């Protein structure tokens, strides 16, 4: 049977699913690790024990325990990101979409969801891999990993909560793909991992971490890189936050054993209710439990790894969205509202800057403010709003990704860069937010090809182009068709630094994506904060 | 006789001079102080003793002892600024141009020449007051004052070389005008002092200094202000430079008396030959002997005087030229040449920045470089050249004058600001230098009205407009004609900050002259250098 697959862990039974008036096979909820519950909480994952009989993989698995956004009850714009299944600590499963008839040895794409390392699900409607697997004829895999304290509580030095266990979950799912995808028609020597935001940062971390490098061939990073200021902390800050978490739950703090044991007795929701109270500063775009530079997963600091070429050398395709910051300002910066134009005063502007660069002394806050203010029109509410939007996006996403790409390209075997600047016509978020963080995802997964969702014809065409770029890159290491007549996505080189825009207009090639600001955020400010 | 005038110091005999096919009276070389020679060198000036008989004032006086530019022998462009008369320490004289028939009580304008406090003459062809006195019917006075070490050697604490004696010379000439101009037809209650560069800085210093305030009514400052980074030094740096001067001439340095006495035995040219060896840094736009914040001429620091309104409150008219810095780069920055386009490489650019902001640490040099570099085209030779030009002008002239104007306007009784951006058609300097430092002077003195000099008809019209603005402002405190139909030069206010361009095109009003850069140079950088 096409729906029956015998893997090294046991037999699995999938289901047939309709897609664009056709069909493909789907294997949902395949377990790749033992349930991280009880004494296993905070612990590194262990391989799932083989099972007898047939595993029923016809329905989505549970979603990991996580914080749930309720800032806009009922609003589709934010609820489309919330868990759509029962949450449970028993959440390490993966999903596979296989073309029909089943391929013999085709390209594999493994999706790693984003969510700031504190949220995310592989089962969201925007992550349905059936469209992409069908249209491009690839085996699509989406995995899951523990988030928040459950996946990133770090008490370096103890084996009970080492940290980075969330990244080990991903690695474990990748190990399973490497060992079993051949039975689903996938070629294990041609797997591309791709993700967005925290997922993009995760992809970059597997490229850096020695233990993950041999598990995949190529990589795609969307709006996220390993060196982002929010993607990781030191072992000291990790330790400091773990202890403060324990203090909010009145736990014994005399020893690691004491704390860990007390945290393992708490119900999942009890840790989630106080998870945000451990941040060191009043801030925006900063999360509590994230990866930590431990000396194991990451041999040394990320900057030294990037300078010495200590990372997997292969081809990579990456880029960012035009307005990465508007989402974090809406939820946490004074002056912004979902139902108004959010024109910002001078007052709130400087207030926003303090919230965006929390680690900066007063001289630094002034450097930023000067770099983003137009003194010929300083009380222009619209310029201050967009100025704050640029700051958040440049500092948190764009400038960090440009640093990575320029460092990587010196040792890589091929780089392709994009700038997504098309605002979907059916967006429910206000206009001032622009090309929002995470909204390029729907084009990558082909949601525009389904009429009932209400996209324009040019948006459907844009989705096919992107799907074909991502898939062609996954297969060959070059998003361009060998002998095509279409416009060519030039290769990003240390010298020219070319990149393309991604929208419904005729392709246009550019150079040095936001260099002015990246030099400020990657060279000047760090130096200023270090000297003063 | 129209050419004979009886002043409080004695009788003076002038001469009749032709001007634009007409005539006026000129009284040249009238002494206002005792010759500062021998034991009087470095000493404060003393009033000229009255004389019997008639003083022959038909020819120009000698020029003060000064450094002479020889970088371009024969070149009119630079030699038009050199002394055109025999140099002598006996140089404290003034010149007066009086309309014919002699007025009864008309407006007076006193010119103070520039030259970085190390050079300058009242007898240069560009300073001939006959055109302006004739065309606007005003009594025009140009004075002289000691420059270089002779006028600014400062050994605070000793009465033999207190410092600022060069400013006291100017004040003395102003005292004479106040006490005697009535006999030449001038109204002593309506005297406007005006000057360019060091002269403009001098005018601003008389506005600040308690002892000079009652000697004039209004003031005009061209490309120079008292708070410029080159216009003054502390008593400590003054002392340090005086001692180093003595060391270059192998003088006894055990005591002030010892040093001073040794310096008074030196020939004038001996001090001038080593005057440039005392600068603390390798620099551009910095001069050896300049005014010093002594606690006498200047009660306290200039910044505190400006903040507390401790200065003469009246009307002022001031502005700058578009390219104030090109002159100092030509003479002292690597890469620039008089006979080439001077396209500058990255190398020489950063080399120029180090020379322009000598007092800056490495973090500061980086702030400047980032603020003036276009990272999308960093090796563009023309952008680096103009970028260096802007830096020198903004830091040394424009941003300092904008700080002064904004501080003054809060307590003044009327401010008028201009931006001169017309490059004379007959300039002998290369094109890359643009609207050069000091070349608005020829329009103020009406040189364009004389055919044989070769200006265009629109330049002659521009000169009359400027002469009428300066003169009308001198008479009433407003450059605009009461009921005119011509375009109005708006008043500069703290709120709107309006200013006008000055060229051959229809007047245009603007706002916030180079604010972006002025905020960088007046608020951010000082803070950065103070914290680091």
Gist of the model:
By secondary structure, chain A is of the alpha/beta class. Helix content of chain A is about 35%, strand content about 15%.
Kindly list the characteristics that best describe this protein.
homodimer; about 525 residues; alpha/beta; Rossmann fold; about 35% helix; globular; neurotransmitter degradation (chains A, B); Acylcholinesterase_fish/snake (chains A, B); lipoprotein (chains A, B)
Write the layout of secondary structure elements.
The structure is a homodimer of 532-residue chains.
Chain A lengths: L3 E4 L2 E4 L1 E5 L2 E10 L22 E3 L19 H4 L13 E6 L7 E7 L17 H7 L2 E4 L5 H5 L12 H16 L5 E11 L1 H11 L9 E5 L12 H14 L7 H9 L3 H5 L29 H7 L7 E6 L4 H7 L13 H11 L5 H11 L8 H28 L6 E6 L20 H4 L12 H20 L21 E5 L6 E3 L3 H17 L1
Parallel strand pairs in A: 2-5, 7-8, 7-9, 9-10, 10-11, 11-12, 12-13
Antiparallel strand pairs in A: 1-2, 3-4, 4-6, 6-8, 13-14
Helix pairs in contact in A: 11-13, 12-16, 13-16
Function (chains A, B): Terminates signal transduction at the neuromuscular junction by rapid hydrolysis of the acetylcholine released into the synaptic cleft. May be involved in cell-cell interactions.
GO molecular function, one term (chains A, B): acetylcholinesterase activity
Protein name (chains A, B): Acetylcholinesterase
Give an account of the 3D structure:
Two copies of one chain form a homodimer. Chain A has 532 residues and is of the alpha/beta class. Chain A has a single domain (1-532), classed as 3-Layer(aba) Sandwich (Rossmann fold). Helix content of chain A is 33%, strand content 15%. Chain A is built from 16 helices and 14 strands. An eleven-stranded mixed β-sheet of chain A has the order 3-4-6-8-7-9-10-11-12-13-14, with helices on both faces. The PDB classes it as hydrolase. The entry lists the keywords radiation damage, time series, alpha/beta hydrolase, neurotransmitter cleavage, glycosylated protein.
């Amino acid at each position: 049977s096409e729906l029956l697959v015998n893997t090294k862990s046991g037999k699995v039974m999938g289901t047939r699913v309709p897609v664009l008036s056709s069909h493909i096979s789907a294997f949902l909820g395949i377990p790749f690790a033992e349930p991280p519950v009880g004494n296993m909480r905070f612990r590194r994952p262990e391989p799932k024990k083989p099972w007898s009989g047939v595993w029923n993989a016809s329905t989505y698995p549970n979603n990991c325990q996580q914080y749930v956004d309720e800032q806009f009850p009922g609003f589709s714009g934010s609820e489309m990101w919330n868990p759509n299944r029962e949450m449970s600590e028993d959440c390490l499963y993966l999903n596979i979409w296989v073309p029909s008839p089943r391929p013999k040895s085709t390209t594999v794409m493994v999706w790693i969801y984003g969510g700031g390392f504190y949220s995310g699900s592989s089962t969201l409607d925007v992550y349905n891999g059936k469209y992409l697997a069908y249209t491009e004829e690839v085996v699509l895999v989406s995995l899951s990993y523990r988030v928040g304290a459950f996946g990133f509580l770090a008490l370096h030095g103890s084996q009970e909560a080492p940290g980075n266990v969330g990244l080990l979950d991903q690695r474990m799912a990748l190990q399973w793909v490497h060992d079993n995808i051949q039975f689903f028609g996938g070629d294990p020597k041609t797997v591309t991992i791709f993700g967005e935001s925290a997922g993009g940062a995760s992809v970059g971390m597997h490229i850096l971490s020695p233990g993950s490098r041999d598990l995949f061939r190529r990589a795609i990073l969307q709006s996220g890189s390993p060196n982002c200021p929010w993607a990781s902390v030191s072992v000291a800050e990790g330790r400091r936050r773990a202890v403060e978490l324990g203090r909010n739950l009145n736990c014994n703090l005399n020893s690691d054993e004491e704390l860990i044991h007390c945290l393992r007795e708490k119900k999942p929701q009890e840790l989630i209710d106080v998870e945000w109270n451990v941040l060191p500063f009043d801030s925006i775009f900063r999360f509590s439990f994230v990866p930590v530079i431990d000396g194991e997963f990451f041999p040394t600091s990320l900057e030294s790894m990037l300078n010495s070429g200590n990372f997997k050398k292969t081809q990579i395709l990456l880029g960012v969205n035009k307005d990465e910051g508007s989402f974090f300002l809406l939820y946490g910066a004074p002056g912004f509202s979902k139902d108004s134009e959010s024109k910002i005063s001078r007052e709130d502007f400087m207030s926003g800057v303090k919230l965006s660069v929390p680690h900066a002394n007063d001289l630094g806050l002034d450097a930023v403010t000067l770099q983003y203010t137009d003194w010929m029109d300083d009380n222009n509410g619209i310029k201050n709003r967009d100025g704050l939007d640029d700051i958040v996006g440049d500092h948190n996403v764009i400038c960090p990704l440009m640093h990575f790409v320029n460092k990587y390209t010196k040792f890589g075997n091929g780089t392709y860069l994009y700038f997504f600047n098309h605002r979907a016509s059916n967006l429910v978020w206000p206009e001032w937010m622009g090309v929002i963080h995470g909204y390029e995802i729907e084009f990558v997964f082909g949601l525009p090809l389904v009429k009932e969702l209400n996209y324009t014809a040019e948006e459907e065409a844009l989705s096919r182009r992107i799907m074909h770029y991502w898939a062609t890159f996954a297969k060959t290491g070059n998003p361009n068709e060998p002998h095509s007549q279409e416009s060519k996505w030039p290769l990003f080189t240390t010298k020219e630094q070319k990149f393309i825009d991604l929208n419904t207009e005729p392709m246009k090639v550019h150079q040095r994506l936001r260099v002015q600001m990246c030099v400020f955020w990657n060279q000047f400010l760090p130096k200023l904060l270090n000297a003063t």
